[PDB]
Amino acid sequence: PLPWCPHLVAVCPIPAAGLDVTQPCGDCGTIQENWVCLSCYQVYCGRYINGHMLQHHGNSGHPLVLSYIDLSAWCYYCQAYVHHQALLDVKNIAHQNKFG
């Protein structure tokens, strides 16, 4: 996993409502394998379910998404996981909500 990527600048402030790691996919409502967009904080399912976060990436261009299964962050442009101090606040909020 990368220690930086050129899309970290697109990570936006966490909503004051916080994160809900049990939030269903905004398109198909599935509770399985969802991700949260780190630009707009919409929640959509992963590639192995109905691929709605990949569709969101396509229709918005938003780069970075956070897994509600394992709190990894994937950048769709870099095609890699990313670890950076800039992602700690959001991973921590998600971790607190998930575990707790």
Ligand SMILES: O=C(O)CCn1nc(-c2cccnc2)ccc1=O
């Ligand atoms: O499931 C998603 O939509 C995002 C998360 N993610 N996406 C991919 C991926 C994306 C597009 C094409 N091939 C692989 C690879 C690893 C990963 O963690």
Ligand SMILES: [Zn+2]
């Ligand atoms: Zn879905």
Ligand SMILES: [Zn+2]
């Ligand atoms: Zn988005």
Ligand SMILES: [Zn+2]
């Ligand atoms: Zn990137």
